[PDB]
Ligand binder design. Sequence first.
Ligand SMILES: [Zn+2]
Lengths: 198, 48, 116, 661
Amino acid sequence: DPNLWTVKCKIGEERATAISLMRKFIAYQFTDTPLQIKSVVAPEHVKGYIYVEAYKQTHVKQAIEGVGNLRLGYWNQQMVPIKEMTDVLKVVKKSWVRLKRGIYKDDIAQVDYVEPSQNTISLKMIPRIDYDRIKAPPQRLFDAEKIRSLGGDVASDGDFLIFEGNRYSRKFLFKSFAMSAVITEGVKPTLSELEKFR
Amino acid sequence: LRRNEQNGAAAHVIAEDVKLLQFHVATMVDNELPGLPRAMQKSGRPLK
Amino acid sequence: ALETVPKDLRHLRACLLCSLVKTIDQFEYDGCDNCDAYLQMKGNREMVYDCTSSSFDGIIAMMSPEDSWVSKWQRVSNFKPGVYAVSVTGRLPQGIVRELKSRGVAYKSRDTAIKT
Amino acid sequence: FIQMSVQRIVEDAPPIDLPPRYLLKFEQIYLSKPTHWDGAPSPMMPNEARLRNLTYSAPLYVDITKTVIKEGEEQLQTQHQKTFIGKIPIMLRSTYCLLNGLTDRDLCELNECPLDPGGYFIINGSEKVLIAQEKMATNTVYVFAKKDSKYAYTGECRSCLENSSRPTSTIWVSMLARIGQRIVATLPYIKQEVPIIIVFRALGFVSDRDILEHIIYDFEDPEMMEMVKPSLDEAFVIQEQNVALNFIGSRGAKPGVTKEKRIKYAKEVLQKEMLPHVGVSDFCETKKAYFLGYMVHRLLLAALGRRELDDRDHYGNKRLDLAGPLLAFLFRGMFKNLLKEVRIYAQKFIDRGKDFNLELAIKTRIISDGLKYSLATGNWGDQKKAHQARAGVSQVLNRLTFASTLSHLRRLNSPIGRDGKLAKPRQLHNTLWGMVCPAETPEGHAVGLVKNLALMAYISVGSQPSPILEFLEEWSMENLEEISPAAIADATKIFVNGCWVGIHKDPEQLMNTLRKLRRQMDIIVSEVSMIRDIREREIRIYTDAGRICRPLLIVEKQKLLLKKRHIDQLKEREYNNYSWQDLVASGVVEYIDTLEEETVMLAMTPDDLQEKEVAYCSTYTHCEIHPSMILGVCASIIPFPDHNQSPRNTYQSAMGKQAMG
RNA sequence: AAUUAGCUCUUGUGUU
Ligand SMILES: [Zn+2]
């Protein structure tokens, strides 16, 4: 079994480093200087370094040449315990959700309609907006009359409103958000949010 | 560290985790350590 | 074999028989390097959606298929070099599994994830 | 600085190159008068800058050549003219200041006092001044005995070639006290020491007699060889060059795990780190061998007591760096940071294969903002690591009374750490006669460490020694690489800025010729100093910056060269053409520095100390202009200072800067 | 009733 080593790298850019190493090895396999790495591991949450499986640290250093992502770990590498091999390879794992990005991060969103297209789903959410008064905030009930009075980008359909950010609201935002842009498992609300929505 | 040991338990990132935690706790009460990097904020200034 | 290498990091799928990380665009235009003799992925998008799912975790860059222990651990010593997802959650359709069984292929799930 | 050092520093930067790449050469710096702006370029005046809290600075423009070279031989040498870099502040009344050559009426029309000396910067509307720092002379072998170590003697030698980004490297050749007398070397960039014989073998001198000839020049008095015997005997298992290279590389900062890496690291540190002033070229081992031989020879002479140890307080051994060298020191690092930034940007934008626009690549604030911060806060170094380097180089100009400003514009700072129990640096050395005021010094915790110039003191600005080398070579001087080592003993060595170059047989004629040339200012400029040692057959020539000197009248046999004609022509000065510079040109007065001042013999006054009386000297060479010129600015307003007790003169020099006026 | 660090300069102790 070839030894395993840790190579330091920039955090967050571990996915494409393996692809670039593949390209290097495939392009160099016909040349007189082939890459001698036996495998490369970049787990889901391991960040800042990548595991390399090769017979010697000399092979690692010779093969990882030309890759800028690992320049921090080019000169120094640490030894991966052999008893930790399996430790490398294990991974552990009308609803309510919470959005992941934007200004609406980490707030309750009630799944109103589930679209069978499996790209976006309908969510009712409390607008965190300033009603086009401050921007050239606390979760508060949407005000249709105030957003009609302040003007700007507004399309009115009685209880329906299309406003800044192409936001669709009724009576309360009702808009489509991606399934991967929300967390569909692990909300478990309390009674206060139910009133809002042993 | 708590969320790492909750699920991951990689047992090797844990070593560096506890090492850095020990360093932070030690420097919180003693910034002048023999042969250790000093604690500084985003100014280059050692802490008090 | 540079063809196994995906062209980008957008919308990757993995086999439930190979767990081979690859774009859906390459799964339709190019297809799997080891499932093409058995399931014929090249030429159908819906068949790619059924065969391969995007719910995969971690990537391993299998470089030398005959010279690595991780391949023996993941039962991919006899599969081609390339990018391999550590574990894929899901099951292939009953029809696909039965067709593989009739053709001499044992369906061994790649779902090695710890289920709490 | 502005005229020469910036151009030299910008060109001396190495080319930056990087799937094709570019060339990106920098040349021909451009600079303008200060100007602010949205707005049109309008000349910003110092008074307006002082009132609006602006910064009196001028932009810097440089010519760039971008040449991307790829497959198929299609390269484009696109040249960008007058590319903006950043703003450099200008000290008032410089050749690039708006108040240059303007008359009294011209300045008064501008709300500027014609009596204002200039000589300060305006940063953020505050008037800053750079206190001239002092430090030890570089490229000179200095032998000191310290009693707090294992070494009986230690011939330290700092070295720096010419304003290079590499920090100055120090060579320590030291003799243990304790067989006995184990001569060792403490090389830079190497953690541990090494015996000298190993180094000499490493340079490529296996032949033992060759090493002895380089180290010892006299082969009839067997004392130097007696002391070097133990050192020679210690190095007996290393005979070949490469084993010595491995030996030296075994102690490096990164010891290569293989022997080849150790050899390459050792040859690198030998040919590019140790002794850079003599040269870090492809091959300089022949001259470096001679220089180390001379260093060990001086150490042996110290051991014999034939040559007394050098003194650390003697300003013949110290250099005073003014605004010029300090600003150049800052600019080296700032330019390197700019180059790293643009290189990183270009590299990041050539991975995608797109063409990068250098106008967007260069970040202007790298040069301007750092220089502004360092001048404002006085922390002389990088902003992120300011605590590492010195502080208080820049101080707010003290406008309390005119004498206060004049005193504060001529101030020297010794960087000896305060709160020190040492008392030697604080004392008044004999060499401060006519150079530093003997009465003006702070009374606080920094007594004797901060000083002031004498009235007629001048500080050499620095000049290239190449004309000196050419003149010296084309005369009877013989170069160092082509001499029989048997001829060294009966000969006189020649040093230029410390680099032992060549040899000579008759030094008296050489010195007389050099004196005539310096008097006529044909090839040797006035600030160049030539010193001859009689006991040790040595002649040293210095042209570098930082040396402190003063004018002195010349005596030919027993009468001054100044005569009634000069005084008559000078009395009618400011009318026809005639001035002090012409007085120097006729070879009547001369600039003497403190190192040459050892070999000179002064007459305080002509009539009193040159007439015929009871014979005391009868062989004067120079005469003082006026002895009261030894005093500084603040001390020269005291009436009858030679009738008081000296501490009272010091107190007056202190309190004259606080008088209302 | 509106802040802290750092740096520099300066005052008194330089009696005999
Ligand atoms: Zn497959």
